[PDB]
Amino acid sequence: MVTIRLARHGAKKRPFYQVVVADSRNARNGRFIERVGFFNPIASEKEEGTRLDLDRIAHWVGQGATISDRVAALIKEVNKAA
Amino acid sequence: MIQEQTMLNVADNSGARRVMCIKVLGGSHRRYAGVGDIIKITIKEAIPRGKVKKGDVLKAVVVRTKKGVRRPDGSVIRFDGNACVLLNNNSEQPIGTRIFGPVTRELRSEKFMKIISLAPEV
Amino acid sequence: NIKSAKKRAIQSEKARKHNASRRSMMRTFIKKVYAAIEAGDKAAAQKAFNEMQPIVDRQAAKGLIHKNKAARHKANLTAQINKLA
Amino acid sequence: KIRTLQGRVVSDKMEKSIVVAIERFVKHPIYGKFIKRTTKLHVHDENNECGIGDVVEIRECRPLSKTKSWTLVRVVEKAV
RNA sequence: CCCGCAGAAGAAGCACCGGCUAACUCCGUGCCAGCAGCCGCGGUAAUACGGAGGGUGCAAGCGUUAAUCGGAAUUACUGGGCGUAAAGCGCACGCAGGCGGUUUGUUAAGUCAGAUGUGAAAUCCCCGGGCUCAACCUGGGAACUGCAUCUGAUACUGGCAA
RNA sequence: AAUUGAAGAGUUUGAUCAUGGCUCAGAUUGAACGCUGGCGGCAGGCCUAACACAUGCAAGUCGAACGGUAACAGGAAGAAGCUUGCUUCUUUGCUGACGAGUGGCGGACGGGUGAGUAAUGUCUGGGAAACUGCCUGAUGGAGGGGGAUAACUACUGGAAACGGUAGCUAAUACCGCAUAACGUCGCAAGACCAAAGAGGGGGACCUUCGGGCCUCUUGCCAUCGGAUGUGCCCAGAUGGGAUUAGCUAGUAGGUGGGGUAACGGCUCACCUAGGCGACGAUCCCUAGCUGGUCUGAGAGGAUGACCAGCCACACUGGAACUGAGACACGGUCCAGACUCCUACGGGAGGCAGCAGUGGGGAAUAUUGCACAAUGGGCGCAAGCCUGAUGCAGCCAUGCCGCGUG
Ligand SMILES: [Mg+2]
Ligand SMILES: [Mg+2]
Ligand SMILES: [Mg+2]
Ligand SMILES: [Mg+2]
Ligand SMILES: [Mg+2]
Ligand SMILES: [Mg+2]
Ligand SMILES: [Mg+2]
Ligand SMILES: [Mg+2]
Ligand SMILES: [Mg+2]
Ligand SMILES: [Mg+2]
Ligand SMILES: [Mg+2]
Ligand SMILES: [Mg+2]
Ligand SMILES: [Mg+2]
Ligand SMILES: [Mg+2]
Ligand SMILES: [Mg+2]
Ligand SMILES: [Mg+2]
Ligand SMILES: [Mg+2]
Ligand SMILES: [Mg+2]
Ligand SMILES: [Mg+2]
Ligand SMILES: [Mg+2]
Ligand SMILES: [Mg+2]
Ligand SMILES: [Mg+2]
Ligand SMILES: [Mg+2]
Ligand SMILES: [Mg+2]
Ligand SMILES: [Mg+2]
Ligand SMILES: [Mg+2]
Ligand SMILES: [Mg+2]
Ligand SMILES: [Mg+2]
Numbered sequence A: 001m002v003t004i005r006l007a008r009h010g011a012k013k014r015p016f017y018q019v020v021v022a023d024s025r026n027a028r029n030g031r032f033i034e035r036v037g038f039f040n041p042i043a044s045e046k047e048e049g050t051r052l053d054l055d056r057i058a059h060w061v062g063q064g065a066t067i068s069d070r071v072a073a074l075i076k077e078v079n080k081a082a
Numbered sequence B: 001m002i003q004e005q006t007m008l009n010v011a012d013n014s015g016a017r018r019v020m021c022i023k024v025l026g027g028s029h030r031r032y033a034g035v036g037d038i039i040k041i042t043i044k045e046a047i048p049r050g051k052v053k054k055g056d057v058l059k060a061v062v063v064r065t066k067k068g069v070r071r072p073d074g075s076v077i078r079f080d081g082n083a084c085v086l087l088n089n090n091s092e093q094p095i096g097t098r099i100f101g102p103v104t105r106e107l108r109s110e111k112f113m114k115i116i117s118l119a120p121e122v
Numbered sequence C: 001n002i003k004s005a006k007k008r009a010i011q012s013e014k015a016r017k018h019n020a021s022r023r024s025m026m027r028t029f030i031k032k033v034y035a036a037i038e039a040g041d042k043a044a045a046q047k048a049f050n051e052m053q054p055i056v057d058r059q060a061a062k063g064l065i066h067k068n069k070a071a072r073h074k075a076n077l078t079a080q081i082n083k084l085a
Numbered sequence D: 001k002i003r004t005l006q007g008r009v010v011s012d013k014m015e016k017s018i019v020v021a022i023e024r025f026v027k028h029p030i031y032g033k034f035i036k037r038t039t040k041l042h043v044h045d046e047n048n049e050c051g052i053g054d055v056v057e058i059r060e061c062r063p064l065s066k067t068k069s070w071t072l073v074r075v076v077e078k079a080v
Numbered sequence E: 001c002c003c004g005c006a007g008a009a010g011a012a013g014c015a016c017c018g019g020c021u022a023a024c025u026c027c028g029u030g031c032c033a034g035c036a037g038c039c040g041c042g043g044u045a046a047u048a049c050g051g052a053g054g055g056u057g058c059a060a061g062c063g064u065u066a067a068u069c070g071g072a073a074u075u076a077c078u079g080g081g082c083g084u085a086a087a088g089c090g091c092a093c094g095c096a097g098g099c100g101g102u103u104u105g106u107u108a109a110g111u112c113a114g115a116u117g118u119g120a121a122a123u124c125c126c127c128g129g130g131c132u133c134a135a136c137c138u139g140g141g142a143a144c145u146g147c148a149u150c151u152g153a154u155a156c157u158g159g160c161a162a
Numbered sequence F: 001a002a003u004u005g006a007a008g009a010g011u012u013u014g015a016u017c018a019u020g021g022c023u024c025a026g027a028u029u030g031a032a033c034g035c036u037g038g039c040g041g042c043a044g045g046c047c048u049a050a051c052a053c054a055u056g057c058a059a060g061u062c063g064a065a066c067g068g069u070a071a072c073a074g075g076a077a078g079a080a081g082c083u084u085g086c087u088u089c090u091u092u093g094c095u096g097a098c099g100a101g102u103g104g105c106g107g108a109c110g111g112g113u114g115a116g117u118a119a120u121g122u123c124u125g126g127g128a129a130a131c132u133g134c135c136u137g138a139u140g141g142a143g144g145g146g147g148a149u150a151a152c153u154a155c156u157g158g159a160a161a162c163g164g165u166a167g168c169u170a171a172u173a174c175c176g177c178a179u180a181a182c183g184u185c186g187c188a189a190g191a192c193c194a195a196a197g198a199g200g201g202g203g204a205c206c207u208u209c210g211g212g213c214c215u216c217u218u219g220c221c222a223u224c225g226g227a228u229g230u231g232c233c234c235a236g237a238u239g240g241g242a243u244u245a246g247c248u249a250g251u252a253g254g255u256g257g258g259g260u261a262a263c264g265g266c267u268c269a270c271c272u273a274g275g276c277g278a279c280g281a282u283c284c285c286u287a288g289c290u291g292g293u294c295u296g297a298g299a300g301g302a303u304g305a306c307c308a309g310c311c312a313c314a315c316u317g318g319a320a321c322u323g324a325g326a327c328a329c330g331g332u333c334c335a336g337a338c339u340c341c342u343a344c345g346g347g348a349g350g351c352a353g354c355a356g357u358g359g360g361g362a363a364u365a366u367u368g369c370a371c372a373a374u375g376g377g378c379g380c381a382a383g384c385c386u387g388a389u390g391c392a393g394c395c396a397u398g399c400c401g402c403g404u405g
Helices: A054-063 A070-075 B110-117 C006-039 C042-062 C069-084
Strands: A002-008 A017-023 A034-039 B007-010 B016-024 B038-046 B057-064 B083-088 B092-094 D008-011 D018-027 D034-044 D055-065 D068-076
Touching: A002 A054, A002 A070, A017 A054, A034 A054, B007 B057, B016 B083, B038 B083, B057 B110, B092 B110, C006 C042, C006 C069, C042 C069, D008 D055, D034 D055
Parallel strands: B007 B083, D034 D068
Antiparallel strands: A002 A017, A017 A034, B007 B016, B016 B038, B038 B057, B057 B083, B083 B092, D008 D018, D018 D034, D055 D068
């Protein structure tokens, strides 16, 4: 079944994840279906640090995708509407 | 029952396929080798990357023969062909590491224990 | 080779024998049908079909011939029998 | 039609085993001159009807044989 | 990452200097020992060998070797040649193939136009953002010069006709 | 805003211009060696022998499917260590838990490699005849029976690997029987197919005090969808050679039978006599393809490590079984090559997973740490597993920064 998860395109000691929808069986940084956000956990308090096209995530969870554990947090941490 | 001119098959991974006996060792004027005796052989034909080349001259112990072997009750074990296992000249002892086809317990010879240990049958 | 799912090896044999028998018995009842068609007996031909239909449909359900494989067989047989029955 | 092909006949002499020539011009990918790159196709035509020299319209069907993935649609012209 | 502590304290090498090519003298040697990417240096004043002083070049690297492309328009499509320098077959006839005067009509394959879809992400590039800088990491664009489908345009080329 | 970028020199001659090779300045490298060598950040690290491999580790998990107790942990009617509340053994699986076994799901992923393959490949663009585990929408299912068996017990053969008898037992193992439509065959009439339970808490009421009953959860069966994955067909493109010009009998097509999840010479029988080929078949040689990488002003030339996609292989040749998926990387079977064990009768094994070793070479690293993160398997969960991964160690191998004042 398809899934929403973090690919780790970071860089030793300063991780920076892509968040992707893909066949759960593939590699954590391998073939995916589409990209649907990102999540810099070193965001720094400056500006940005967790952009996340919700209305797609939506779409796939409609089509049956499961979500990670971390991602699930981020969504319920983006809040949702504000 | 082998003698000079007799061809033999090979019961090991020596690389020799066909050998000839050019001598029956073990006694002046001695005609036959059989059972499990040591013979001197020349190599009539061998595979292309074996432990031995054709034309090589060394010893071997006969381990299978058409004439076979009698046992202390009268029975006989007879083989469809004659086979020997190549040995190194200044040591007897087998040049190969694997043995093929059955052999007889007559080889209980100390120096041929590896030959029984290996080898499928009897 | 040494790893738990040695178990799997011995398992797939239990399975294999199971399916082997039901797989034969099935193609037997299938044979009985093509037999009558080659014979000429339209009745035994229908008689054969009506006893094999369930066991095919049935096997499929159980899943050693899953779906359409059955279908084809019925379809085929049905044509044959009333081709001259 | 989801696309169609034209082409002359080239060979009719075989129980529906019709093969058709197709002709394109193409710019040589290296020296720019335009040359004739021909294509032959093995097409089905039930009850054999075209004849060597006929222009014919053709369409891509599923496999009718190891070789055949095209039936014909219409004929055009004859007695070349 | 931050604060204190001691004391310049632990921390410079390699190739080159005849021309190409940035950098010159002396001593030794004497067609020897030897150098050399190419030219070519060495037989008594060697800026070319070896050493030394000085200098030039690079620096935790520096040289040598190997390897791709470049300069090479030296396989020339863009972008070359064959009288005498490499190169016109000894001559002809001709199949395939390439090319083909001039007119009108038709076709719409080559050609041209538009629309749609597709051209994975990374990479490259532009504008930013984050690690003290940079390498590195990242947002977003741009680009992927391509392919196909549909509809059109008919001057040129191809097809058909006369 | 976003490819807006192009240089020449040395050397045939006494000298010259031309012709023409040789050479040089530049970028680039998974590099090696020689001299030298201070620190850090990111990266790279067997290019050779798809050579051969010692040892550890690289796939398990679920007691909320099942009978269960062998280990250690408690508790227990009751027997006790007794220093009368602190507690010892007989036992008792009573539950916390759990070796072994049955069962379930995963061992088809992740990770390795480039051998074979000039096309069951790859890239581009398309097509019709198919299946699709877990996840998800919809609609109903989930009745009632049966015979087994491992474990275990006894006896017994082996040095070991691992067996032989006889019993004995549970289930989400297995099979009938029912039920059967918007499913399958069928123009129709008709005919035909399925399943499994397990927990959590709970008012009466009460039961053989185990539970019914209520209640929610989770799994189980069927049909049609989705989603994804995969199978298949067409066209173009994707190395070289004529000192290779002819190739082809399942060959090309048809008809029918069979077959596959599916179209199909896929297979067969019979018929037609076709099919390919100088727009390069056949034969031979070499080769995984791509995105892209280097270079070049471009056009090109060269290239396919590291990252991502596809294919292919898993000691060599061949096979199939299980399964939704394999003709299976740490599965099975046969043959082979080769290695290990042995009490000599017989057994066992495959690093192109990680590290490591021998060998080859000019040359390429530690038998490290951790599941903390991310990702994967299983579990309601807690968790367990994870050489994927995240880190660390080694080498100036490269890039970048900095210092040695
Ligand atoms: Mg049929
Ligand atoms: Mg100068
Ligand atoms: Mg010098
Ligand atoms: Mg001097
Ligand atoms: Mg050039
Ligand atoms: Mg010229
Ligand atoms: Mg000349
Ligand atoms: Mg002439
Ligand atoms: Mg004209
Ligand atoms: Mg892209
Ligand atoms: Mg900055
Ligand atoms: Mg015209
Ligand atoms: Mg001169
Ligand atoms: Mg050193
Ligand atoms: Mg257990
Ligand atoms: Mg190869
Ligand atoms: Mg069942
Ligand atoms: Mg029924
Ligand atoms: Mg039941
Ligand atoms: Mg057919
Ligand atoms: Mg150029
Ligand atoms: Mg790798
Ligand atoms: Mg195999
Ligand atoms: Mg199967
Ligand atoms: Mg292995
Ligand atoms: Mg290893
Ligand atoms: Mg060595
Ligand atoms: Mg690793």
